[PDB]
Amino acid sequence: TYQRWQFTLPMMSTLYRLANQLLTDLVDDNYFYLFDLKAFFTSKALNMAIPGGPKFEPLVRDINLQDEDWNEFNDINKIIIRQPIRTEYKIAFPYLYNNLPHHVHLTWYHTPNVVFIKTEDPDLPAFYFDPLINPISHRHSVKSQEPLPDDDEEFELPEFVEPFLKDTPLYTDNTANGIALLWAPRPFNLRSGRTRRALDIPLVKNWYREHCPAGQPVKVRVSYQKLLKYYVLNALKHRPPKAQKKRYLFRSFKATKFFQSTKLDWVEVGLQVCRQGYNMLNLLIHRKNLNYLHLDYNFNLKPVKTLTTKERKKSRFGNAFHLCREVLRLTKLVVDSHVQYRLGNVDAFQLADGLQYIFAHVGQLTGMYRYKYKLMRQIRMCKDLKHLIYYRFNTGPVGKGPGCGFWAAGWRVWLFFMRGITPLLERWLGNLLARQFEGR
Amino acid sequence: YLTEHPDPNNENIVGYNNKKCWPRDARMRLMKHDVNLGRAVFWDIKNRLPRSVTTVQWENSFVSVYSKDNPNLLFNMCGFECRILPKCRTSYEEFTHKDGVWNLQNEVTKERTAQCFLRVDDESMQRFHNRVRQILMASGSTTFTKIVNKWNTALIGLMTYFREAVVNTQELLDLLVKCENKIQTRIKIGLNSKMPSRFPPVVFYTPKELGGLGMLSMGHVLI
C-alpha cells in the first residue's frame, strides 16, 4: 500500500539539488515581514489592506469611517505629526494604533537572522572558513610569548586517558550536504515522513508568498492577490474534522456481484469511461423517444431538423444534462488528447502545452457556466495561476513564446472540485432518474 | 449650565444631532467648549417656555456651534441643508462638486465674505424614494403616458425647487440615475419580459407632440 518511508541522507541531497529550481533558497523566516498568515488575518479584521494584494471586504462590523469629526481626543492641532502612521505599522502591533480592534491575531518577532555559508560546490572541505565575514579578532593585546607558570604542576598533571576522538574520520565526509538538509524546511528536514498523495503537493504554493513581482504589470499582481485571498479564506474555514464513522465507497461494491476488479491500462479505462458515458446519455435520450438529437461524441448536443413545433420546450434541460455533458466533455477531451499522444501526436512538450491550454479551455471553452456560476472563482484561480507560471517560466531566453507550463495546480484544483461536487450530482441523479423511470 | 446640569464624566458629547454633510472637515467640532455651549443654549431656551404647552425635543433638534475650533457652520432649513464658511478667515477645503458657491458679498464693503455650500436634505431624498416606489407599484394597467407625466411632475418637484444643490449632492445624482433606470425597468419590460440589451431611449424622449412620452430626463442616456 506504500505507507511511510525512511529516506537516507544523500538520497535527499540529490533530490534537493534536483528540485533547486522549484524551491526557495532564501531560508530566514523573516523576509515575510507581516506578509504571513497572522498579518493577513490582522489586515482583514482591522479592515486595512496590506499592499501584498489581499484587499478583502470588512468583517461583520460594517463601520467604514468618520466616527467623529473633531474631538479633543483626535484633534489635529494637538498632535506632533513628525512622520505618518501607515497601514504596515497598524498591522505590525495593532493593539496600540488600531482603535477598537476585534478578532485579531499577532505575528512573531523573529530577530534571529538565519546565517548560513552557502558554498560553491562539493569540492571544498566541510568546515572551510569562507572569506566572507571579517577577520577573526585582529587581536594584539595578548602577550604570552614566554612560557606559562603552570610547569611544575603541569609535569605533575599527566593525561592518563586515551585521546578524545583520535579514532574518528577527520570530521570531513559527505556531511556538508547533511547540514544543507537541515535548512530545507518541509521536504528535506523530514527524514522519514508519511505516504502523501500526489495532488496534495502543490509545487507552486511557495512562490506567491515571497513578493515575486519586481516591476510586473497589474495582471500578475492581481493574480497573486486572488491566490492569497483563496489561501487565507482556506486557512480560516479549517476546523478539525472528526465524524462520518469512516464510511468508504468502492469497498463494499466488490463484495457483491455488481463489481469485478481488474488491471486495465489507463488510456483503456479512460476510453471505456467515455464510451460508457456516451452510451448512458444516448440511452437516456432514446428512452425519451427523441429521435432528432445527437451528442456527436464531443458531448456537444446537436439538433437535427429545427425542432420548433412543440419540441424546443421538451428539450430544455438546463440543470444536470448540461452539467454532466460539460463534465464528460472535459473528461473525454483529456482522454482523447492522451490517446493522440499514444496514437502519434506531437509527442514532445507540446503535450503538456496542450494540457495547459486544455485547462484554459475548461476555464473558457468548456461550457459549464450555465449549470453553475460558482466556477468563476476557480477559473479566475486558474487564470491567475497561469501568469503565476509564465513570469516564473518565461524569464530569460524564453520571453514571448508559448511556455508549455504544467498542470501541477490546475489539475489539482479540478480534482478538488470534482471531489467536492460528486455528491451534488449523486443527488440530482437520484432526483431525476425517479422522474424518468418511476413517476413524478 | 454646570450648576443646573453638570457633566463631569465627559458625557456631554454623547448624544448630539450631527449631519452627514462630510463630517470630516464640516461636522461640528465636538470640543468640550462648543458642545457645552450648544447644550446649555438649548436648555436655556427650553427653560423659557413651559414644558406642558410645548418643548423642543433634543432628539429632533440640532445645534450648530462656531468658534476658533469649529469653522464649519451647519444649517438645515425646511428644504435642503446648508453650510457657510468665510472666504478670508481660514476657509475649509471648498470641494464644490458642482458649481454651487454663494459669494455672499458684504452689504457695505462689497467684498466676498463666505460660501454657503448647499446640499439636498435627507427628507426630500426619502420623499423622492417614496415617490419612485409608489410609481413602481402603480403597475398592472397604467398607460405609459401617465407614468411619464407622473415622473415629470416628480422631477420638476425635485428640480426647479433646488437647482444649485441638486448638482452638489453626488448621491442625489446617482439616485436620480438609479431611479430613471428603475423606471426603464417595466418601461422596457412592460412589453416583453426580457430586459433587453440596447433599447434606445428614443422610444421615450420623443415628446407626445409626435406621439412618444416626453420623458424630461437628467441622467446620461447615451444615444
Binding site: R221 | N181, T185, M195
Partner: peptide
C-alpha cells in the same frame, strides 16, 4: 465599447439587473 466610459457619473459595469461580479483591476 464605442463610448468613452469616463464621462459617466461614477461607473457603469451593467444595469441589466445582474451585477454579481465586482472588479475593475484598481489594486
Amino acid at each position: 465599447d464605442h463610448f468613452n466610459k469616463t464621462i459617466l457619473p461614477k461607473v457603469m459595469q451593467v444595469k441589466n439587473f445582474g451585477r454579481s461580479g465586482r472588479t475593475k483591476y484598481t489594486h
